[PDB]
Design a protein around this ligand. Sequence first.
Ligand SMILES: Nc1nc2c(ncn2[C@@H]2O[C@H](COP(=O)(O)OP(=O)(O)NP(=O)(O)O)[C@@H](O)[C@H]2O)c(=O)[nH]1
Ligand SMILES: [Mg+2]
Length: 254
Amino acid sequence: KGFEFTLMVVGESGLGKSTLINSLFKIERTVQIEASTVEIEERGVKLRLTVVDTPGYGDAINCRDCFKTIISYIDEQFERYLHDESGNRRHIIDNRVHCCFYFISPFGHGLKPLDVAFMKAIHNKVNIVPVIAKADTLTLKERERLKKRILDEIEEHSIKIYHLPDAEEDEDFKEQTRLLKASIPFSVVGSNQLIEAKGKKVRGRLYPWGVVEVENPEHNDFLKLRTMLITHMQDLQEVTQDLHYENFRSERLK
Ligand SMILES: Nc1nc2c(ncn2[C@@H]2O[C@H](COP(=O)(O)OP(=O)(O)NP(=O)(O)O)[C@@H](O)[C@H]2O)c(=O)[nH]1
Ligand SMILES: [Mg+2]
């Protein structure tokens, strides 16, 4: 009994993409597409979590090149899945990208022109979850001003984004659902380093005026992103099967 899920991370270079995924479950600049895998096996359950790191655009890599290589990768995993399906292989190993975190610079008006290009290049091929990178550069009012616009410009530009399901019908879930739905785009902070924050070493951003904690819900939206991801793996998977994969199958079998 096997379950496989693949997460991709995408966006402008230097937005802390590699740092955040290393932090999810000397850390150099990402030059090519790099996949890392976490295989959990016990009893008769075999979980496979793949994380696809991508080189960001704008520093040594021009945006058109960057999303061409990313699109190429996504279409390849569709290709592979189709081939395994094209003969019967009723039990396949699934490499499709079921979720893509789009990292947005905190320094922008909302989505910069190149971001809109990128997102629209891939929004029909993958579930996009937009995140505000390096949120420790942002005041709470600044976070909120940015969050609104990103959402506004996503609508303005007809950018297709993964939306959460809700209500199967329950109470504790009713809150967590509306909360997570409201806190999008998540403003996140990542850290590769641990700092003595009184009695236990927590990650992890040491400034002379204070310390930023990755896993403090009041500092940033990391745990919210992480729990959103865990608890919605199944929906994200079905949608890429029913909507994104079908549109691939649409064109290639034609
Ligand atoms: N302010 C701030 N800086 C961060 C944060 N996370 C990482 N950084 C810094 O940003 C640097 C670049 O991080 P990195 O994860 O490599 O970014 P990237 O998006 O993967 N870069 P690339 O796309 O070029 O490979 C890190 O070396 C770290 O010093 C964060 O949450 N906040
Ligand atoms: Mg990187």
